[PDB]
Amino acid sequence: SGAIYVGNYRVVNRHLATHNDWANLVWEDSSRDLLVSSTTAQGCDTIARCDCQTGVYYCSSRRKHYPVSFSKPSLIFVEASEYYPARYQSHLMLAVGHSEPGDCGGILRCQHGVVGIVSTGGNGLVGFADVRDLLWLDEE
Ligand SMILES: CCc1ccsc1CN1C[C@@H](C(N)=O)CCC1=O
Numbered sequence: 001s002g003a004i005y006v007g008n009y010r011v012v013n014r015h016l017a018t019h020n021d022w023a024n025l026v027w028e029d030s031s032r033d034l035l036v037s038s039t040t041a042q043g044c045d046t047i048a049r050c051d052c053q054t055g056v057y058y059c060s061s062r063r064k065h066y067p068v069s070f071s072k073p074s075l076i077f078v079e080a081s082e083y084y085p086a087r088y089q090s091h092l093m094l095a096v097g098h099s100e101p102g103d104c105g106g107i108l109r110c111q112h113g114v115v116g117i118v119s120t121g122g123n124g125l126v127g128f129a130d131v132r133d134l135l136w137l138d139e140e
């Protein structure tokens with residue numbers, strides 16, 4: 001589990017969104033595994049606006065923050081899981097690292113701020129849903 005809190009927005013994995021998130025929906029995309037809902041209180045996170053390919057992510061199944069190199073956001077085939085059939089997921093970045101289903105929501109950060117959240121895993125890889133292209137998260 002995990003979320004990003006920026007301005008009056010909450011960014012979560014679409015597959016982990018709550019009934020309150022869907023009732024207060026701002027934007028969602030199944031192909032990215034992302035959902036953004038509105039909040040009453042202001043958040044403190046800053047979204048990175050950069051093309052960094054190194055950073056640190058939190059892995060809850062190891063209680064550890066790992067430094068990683070990761071690929072640029074791409075369209076990647078993701079095998080079937082409990083939440084989606086086999087499909088291509090867009091805006092996904094991979095790194096060599098550990099990721100189990102309950103690790104989704106763990107933040108990936110660089111020197112500029114939040115880059116994305118854990119979304120995929122298995123086979124010694126970890127996949128992150130990018131949020132750096134969602135510029136509207138910084139305004140109104
Ligand atoms: C062992 C596979 C694994 C490891 C970490 S997430 C995962 C499989 N997964 C894929 C997610 C997606 N974005 O399609 C949806 C939720 C989920 O359980």
Ligand SMILES: [Zn+2]
Pocket residue numbers: 048049050051052110111112113
């Ligand atoms: Zn950066």
